[PDB]
Design an enzyme around this catalytic site. Structure first.
Site, PDB file in Angstrom:
ATOM      1  N   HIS A  14       0.818  -1.216   0.000  1.00  0.00           N
ATOM      2  CA  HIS A  14       0.000   0.000   0.000  1.00  0.00           C
ATOM      3  C   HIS A  14       0.845   1.257   0.000  1.00  0.00           C
ATOM      4  CE1 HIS A  14      -4.199  -1.096   0.094  1.00  0.00           C
ATOM      5  NE2 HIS A  14      -3.883  -2.129   0.852  1.00  0.00           N
ATOM      6  N   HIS A  69     -12.838  -3.183   3.400  1.00  0.00           N
ATOM      7  CA  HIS A  69     -11.753  -3.162   2.428  1.00  0.00           C
ATOM      8  C   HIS A  69     -12.111  -3.844   1.108  1.00  0.00           C
ATOM      9  CE1 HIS A  69      -8.621  -2.300   5.752  1.00  0.00           C
ATOM     10  NE2 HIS A  69      -9.839  -2.079   6.209  1.00  0.00           N
ATOM     11  N   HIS A 118      -5.607   4.125   1.110  1.00  0.00           N
ATOM     12  CA  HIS A 118      -5.533   2.696   1.372  1.00  0.00           C
ATOM     13  C   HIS A 118      -6.730   1.992   0.744  1.00  0.00           C
ATOM     14  CE1 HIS A 118      -4.534  -0.882   3.995  1.00  0.00           C
ATOM     15  NE2 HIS A 118      -5.727  -1.183   3.517  1.00  0.00           N
ATOM     16  N   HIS A 142      -5.424 -16.015  -1.091  1.00  0.00           N
ATOM     17  CA  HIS A 142      -5.439 -14.564  -0.963  1.00  0.00           C
ATOM     18  C   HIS A 142      -4.202 -14.038  -0.226  1.00  0.00           C
ATOM     19  CE1 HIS A 142      -7.940 -10.735  -0.479  1.00  0.00           C
ATOM     20  NE2 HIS A 142      -6.799 -10.487   0.140  1.00  0.00           N
ATOM     21  N   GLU A 146      -0.862 -11.953  -1.891  1.00  0.00           N
ATOM     22  CA  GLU A 146      -0.432 -10.620  -1.485  1.00  0.00           C
ATOM     23  C   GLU A 146       0.994 -10.608  -0.935  1.00  0.00           C
ATOM     24  OE1 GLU A 146      -3.787  -9.147   0.976  1.00  0.00           O
ATOM     25  OE2 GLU A 146      -4.528  -8.248  -0.881  1.00  0.00           O
TER      26      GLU A 146
HETATM   27 ZN   LIG Z   1      -4.694  -4.088   1.101  1.00  0.00          ZN
HETATM   28 ZN   LIG Z   2      -6.817  -3.074   3.384  1.00  0.00          ZN
HETATM   29 ZN   LIG Z   3      -6.238  -8.492   0.733  1.00  0.00          ZN
END
Ligand SMILES: [Zn+2]
Ligand SMILES: [Zn+2]
Ligand SMILES: [Zn+2]
Length: 243
Positions: A14, A69, A118, A142, A146
């Site tokens: 991020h 999110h 974000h 997931h 990431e």
């Molecule tokens: Zn994220």
């Molecule tokens: Zn997030």
């Molecule tokens: Zn994620």
């Protein structure tokens, strides 16, 4: 995307995205007022606190469910029924940031800006735009994805000053929604039968471990670059609106 470290890009995709977006603004010598970049850097501690707070504390991370999110552009929902999603949440902090900025409360302003950035960043992650969590099938994909992203992200920096200026209207929701649409369109480039089968086999095969990683790399590159350009334009919008 990851945000494991508060003030380092190593395991904070991020922060990396935001930093690259700011670099795009710096590279643009035709339409960007560089004092905007100077302000972002002057209040960088607060900006980074905001980027990091989203995934680490309430109300931002929704009791570790991270519901806010996610945002699916086709039905406008997150993965938990009736929960707040990324579009409304990102816009919420975009405005709070702006109001504070106008009131000369800089720490408050950039902290909230960081939060908003974000959320915008998240909808650029295809899984977040398709409500595919770490619990979705194949479960565990997931998080592994990431984490993998952090190992290759630096190979996809946007090196020009072409951010998506005035990409959408003046409403931040339109930007968040718009970014999510593109991300969802790219979802199948990360999550499909092949990546799912190979990820599963990776459990007992180094060959397949390298296989799915290689497979998702091209689209990951696209998503990272799009995320940078969109974020650059979003920041420019913020200053145009409240500065
Ligand atoms: Zn994220
Ligand atoms: Zn997030
Ligand atoms: Zn994620």
């Amino acid at each position: 995307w990851s945000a494991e470290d508060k003030h380092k890009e190593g395991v904070n995709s991020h922060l990396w995205i935001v930093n690259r977006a700011i670099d795009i603004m710096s590279r643009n010598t035709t339409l960007v007022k560089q004092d905007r970049v100077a302000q972002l850097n002057e209040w960088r501690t607060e900006l980074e606190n905001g980027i990091y707070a989203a995934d680490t504390e309430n109300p931002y991370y929704d009791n570790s469910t991270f519901a806010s999110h996610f945002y699916d552009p086709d039905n406008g929902k997150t993965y938990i029924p009736f929960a707040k999603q990324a579009k409304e949440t990102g816009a919420k902090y975009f405005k709070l940031a702006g109001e504070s900025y106008k009131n000369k409360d800089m720490k408050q302003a950039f902290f909230y800006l960081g939060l908003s950035l974000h959320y915008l960043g998240d909808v650029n992650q295809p899984m977040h735009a398709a409500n595919f969590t770490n619990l979705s099938y194949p479960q565990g994909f997931h998080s592994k994805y990431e984490n993998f992203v952090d190992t290759i992200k630096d190979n996809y920096k946007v090196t020009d000053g072409n951010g998506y200026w005035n990409w959408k209207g003046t409403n931040p929701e339109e930007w968040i929604h718009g970014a999510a649409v593109v991300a969802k369109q790219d979802y199948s480039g990360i999550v499909n039968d092949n990546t799912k089968d190979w990820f599963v086999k990776a459990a007992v095969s180094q060959e397949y471990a390298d296989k799915w990683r290689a497979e998702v790399t091209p689209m990951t590159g696209k998503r990272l670059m799009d995320a940078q350009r969109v974020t650059a334009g979003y920041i420019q919008l913020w200053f145009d609106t409240y500065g």
